[PDB]
Amino acid sequence: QSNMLWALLRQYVRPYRWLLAVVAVLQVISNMASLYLPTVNAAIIDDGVAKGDTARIVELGAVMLGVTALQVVCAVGAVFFGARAATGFGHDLRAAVFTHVTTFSAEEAGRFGAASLLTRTTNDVGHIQQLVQLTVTMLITAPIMSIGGIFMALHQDAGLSWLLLVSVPVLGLANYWIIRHLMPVFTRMQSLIDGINRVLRDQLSGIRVIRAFAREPLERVRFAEANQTLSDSALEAGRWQALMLPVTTLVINVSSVALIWFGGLRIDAGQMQVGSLIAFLAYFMQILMAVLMATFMLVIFPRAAVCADRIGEVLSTQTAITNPADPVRPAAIAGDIGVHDATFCYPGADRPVLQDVSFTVPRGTTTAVVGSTGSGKSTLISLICRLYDVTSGSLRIDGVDVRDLDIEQLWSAIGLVPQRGYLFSGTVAENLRYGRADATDDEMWEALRVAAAADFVRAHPQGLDMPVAQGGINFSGGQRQRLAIARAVIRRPAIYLFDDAFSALDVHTDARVRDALREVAADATVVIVSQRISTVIEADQVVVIDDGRVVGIGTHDTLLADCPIYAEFAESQAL
Amino acid sequence: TRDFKGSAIRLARRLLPQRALTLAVILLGVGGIAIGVIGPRILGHATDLLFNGVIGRELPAGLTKEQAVEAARARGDGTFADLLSGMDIVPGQGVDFGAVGRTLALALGLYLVAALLVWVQARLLNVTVQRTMVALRAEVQEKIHRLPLSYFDSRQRGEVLSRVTNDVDNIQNSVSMTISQLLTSVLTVFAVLVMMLTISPLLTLFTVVTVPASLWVTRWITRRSQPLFVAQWRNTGRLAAHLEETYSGFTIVKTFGHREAAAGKFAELNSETQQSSFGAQFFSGLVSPATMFIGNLSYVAVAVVGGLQVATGQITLGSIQAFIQYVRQFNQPLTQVAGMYNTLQSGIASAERVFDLLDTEEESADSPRRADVRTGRVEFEHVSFSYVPGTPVIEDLSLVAEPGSTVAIVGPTGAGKTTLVNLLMRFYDVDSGRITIDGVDIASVSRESLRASIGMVLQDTWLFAGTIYDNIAYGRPDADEDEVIEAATAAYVDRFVHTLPNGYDTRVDDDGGAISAGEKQLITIARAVLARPKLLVLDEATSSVDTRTELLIAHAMAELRRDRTSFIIAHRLSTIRDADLILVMDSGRIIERGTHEELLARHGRYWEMTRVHLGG
Ligand SMILES: Nc1ncnc2c1ncn2[C@@H]1O[C@H](COP(=O)(O)OP(=O)(O)OP(=O)(O)O)[C@@H](O)[C@H]1O
Ligand SMILES: Nc1ncnc2c1ncn2[C@@H]1O[C@H](COP(=O)(O)OP(=O)(O)O)[C@@H](O)[C@H]1O
Ligand code: VO4
Ligand SMILES: [Mg+2]
Ligand SMILES: [Mg+2]
């Protein structure tokens, strides 16, 4: 199975097909020059040595010198244009993969994972580019050398070219048999390499959990078994690969011996000259040495095929969230949330997670969303962001459907701190620039102060330039939460979406941050997902969802008297 | 900066250890190369027999060789006699095909023997290469399990993963595609040089003149191409880092309107990588044509001088045929090595990175003593710790935990509550002081046994790619179905698992799945519960779980909390109410401690924290 590999090559080498044609022409010229040098040597033997004509020997040596100059010029041109074509192909394939991945929604991106996307954006593309480069450089030499050597043998002595016409197909058949037996072994080896890489990725990603549960012996045993299986497959592949050199050399040598025998039979008669033996020996030594060179790097083909399968799997994914035909562009979207009879079901699920959800969040007000674990609060927050599309109903931000908007202005009006957040590697100022990207240090410090994050940033010697690890794991959990809050604050958005952004804060820090946000986000719409009933009293409207549907809408006092679920929550949280 | 010659030497030493099997590989290669190099001399002898017969057939039989040479001199042009002088022909004889056939049979037998020896050598090489690759992967895995946490914290996950997975595969590919070529080429060069010395010193001098010139041109090209390779790897690393940052935080990049900035940065890094890759590839590939050009210059010189000498009679035609074959077989190894220089260079870079990872400093010498918590008492004695030395996070801290006591740790957002339990688990080494469990220091015991003794719910929940059942059983994989189901039910994982159509069989992941944050935390709770730990650490175990569910969880976990010395870190004071001991720490120091009643009576920080609910 290599259908996807050929499709990828056909699609992404098309701009460089003329460079490929130039490379092919230069390669055939250089290979015929290297094959013609022995022909001039044969002419030296027949015309100069056999007749005592030293002037002819010198003249043919000058011809050989010119042929060598032509050969080196063509080889240099070939390597230059091949490098151009291969690097261009790799660059274009990387760009295409990245561009397609950046159009993914949350669901499509999660179908692959960030690590897999990175690996098949860099290393799989590199593998296919290496296939292209080695095909241009060395793999095409063997067919060109074989055909050119057959034609050179016909030109030298047509009565003995049958020896090449027999020897080339014999070696081709033997190599084809070896390759037929070897390719499935190589594919199995690549599968086991992928498995061992997955094991290593799992071990590295959860190293803290591995050490917490003392899972070192289990991981060690798993890796040992995977390593042994991969080694067995690689040993089988090497067993099949170790036959390629001896068979090729044996064909070389048997052909050389038969050449001497039959050429001597023809030279005893007036049918052949002695220098043709030298010419044919060099023809064998060149043709099958080129075949040997091309046969050694055959592992790159199944690897390229599986990498192309992965790349085409990514490139064949269709996005579900796009700007439909012509997005409506309201001026300074700063208003309310509609959410009219919204129903959402996750793809691949048997039952909807949200059913008949209908509630309106007035502009400039704070709405609290409460519910049990797995109720659908995060799903509702993602629906507001249009990270997921409602199966039925609509969301109607500013009275217009989120589908009818282009998702850049909707996101620019929303300052979101997700339940599963992320802080990028770099500095605190760089991370806060994701909110604004043109913020001054003064407003950066103001945002840090609002999020109660100014103290631990000022405490660092580098201030706003304090380093940040890849996920912010050089910070405490609540420090990460406050950095996310500050990133949302520095944006100064029209809508604040707090998807449980205060679970890692202590009571004092939570109170300080909530008062600062109340002072700051007074003019902005706020939708907050919270578990503490004490913090939802300040909310203008409280929404209670259970089992995936709204069970009560109203204020805290109204809901503690009319909503059994809200009453149970208040009773549980009562002190 | 980086040592590539040393890394190549280390890789070669790993591939070719002491003389157990590498000696056999070397000897088989030498024997095969010598036997297959002898062959062209035999073929040249056969050609000499053919040429002698063909030339001597046309001369009159009544003359001897000296008489034939004299007659040719008496004729015109002078040079046919000089050619005849070195032929050693017998006029009127013709070609003796019996000698030709016997010579060719000898050549065929030698060629068969050489092919068999080369095949055996290739098989042995494959075996030894796979042995070293298995050893390398095992060493990498052990190093991963031995490194400190600050190593992973200070680097990106994708970079470490590529250094651990991609570089090892690159080493495997480069070795398996170059090692046999390298050995055969090195042996062939000297064997062919010996045979060319045997044939004629002048032409072998002309042929060996290439090695100085070829090495000089190779040095020039490699000097021009090494900075290009360094730039190519630097740009590739930058591109991979940008891609990893964009993919990992794709929700933040996408939602905060930074998709276009990431696209432009990727475009610039991709262009830089392409330019560097093209330059490196072009200059690396220039090596083979230059070597071929110098070899062809020597071939032309050898052919011309050999033809002149044979026409003069100093060298026979069969000898010149053998020498031309040897010139080709001498130039081929150099061209092969030059062509595979790029693969060798990539493999050596990968070996440099892998050996850099393998040479990193490790945690410490892990003690062989097995942990044994007799009762469960935990004590801190003036424990001081600090990441990035110069910024203390914990100093002069002490506590006593009774074997059945539930110790609650409360305080501000960056006090050091997670750092305390990370020191207890010995995730990091204590700078000053010591931590004892039941009177034995945790620094003088095996880390594995100590960490298996304590069951921890991590603050950052993590699940591996697999089913919910596998994730829960990760705590104790040898447990039966009933134990896993009971652990899931106690943590109320079963309540939401029953809803799903693939109960316990639905696949979940760290970054996704059919799970929510609260349900992920519940699964981690069940995973820690199934481990039946002797010491319990719940580091904010109900932060993402609602209070109604957390009450039932506490009711179910009261069985475990009774006799396992639970360490509770919680910002919800209701969950840590009625705990035997409550610790309030502010800046890495326990500023106040005691039970709920004493802390309320003493007022202080805990009273203020509890009064936040009541307002003021
Ligand atoms: N891919 C998915 N991502 C998230 N939830 C999913 C997915 N597939 C199915 N679900 C279901 O969605 C339901 C609601 O998930 P969601 O994350 O919105 O819950 P929540 O109540 O907001 O979170 P929490 O547990 O933090 O209170 C869950 O019961 C879960 O089974
Ligand atoms: N792996 C780490 N590397 C560097 N600093 C860390 C690391 N883990 C925690 N810290 C720092 O330790 C400080 C306090 O310790 P921590 O356990 O995080 O506090 P708390 O548990 O009260 O949140 C924080 O300011 C945090 O940035
Ligand atoms: O470890 V915390 O930042 O939730 O106190
Ligand atoms: Mg949620
Ligand atoms: Mg913490």
Numbering used by the authors:
A (entry chain A): -2 to 572
B (entry chain B): 14 to 629
Source paper text:
Here, we determine mycobacterial MsRv1273c/72c to be an isoniazid efflux pump and determine several structures by cryo-electron microscopy showing specific asymmetrical features including an N-terminal extending loop and a periplasmic helical hairpin only found in MsRv1272c. Thus, MsRv1273c should have a degenerate site impaired for ATPase activity while MsRv1272c has a functional consensus site with the classic enzymatic motifs. Confirmation that this is correct was achieved by mutating both E553Q and D497N, creating the double mutant, which has little activity. Together, these results indicate that the consensus site of MsRv1273c/72c is functional with normal ATPase activity while its degenerate site exhibits very low activity. Thus, MsRv1273c/72c is a drug efflux pump for isoniazid, but not ethambutol.
In another experiment, vanadate (Vi) was added in an attempt to trap the transporter in a conformation immediately after ATP hydrolysis. In such a state, ADP together with vanadate should stabilize the NBD dimer and trap an Occ state. After treatment with ATP and vanadate, the cryo-EM structure of MsRv1273c/72c was solved and showed an ATP | ADP+Vi-bound Occ (Vi) state at 2.7 Å resolution. Since both structures adopt a similar conformation, only the ATP-bound Occ state was analyzed and compared here. In this study, we expected to capture the OF state by using AMPPNP, vanadate or the EtoQ mutant to induce NBD closure. However, the IFasym states and Occ state were observed instead of the OF state. Our results imply that the transporter is more stable at the Occ state than the OF state when the NBDs are fully closed.
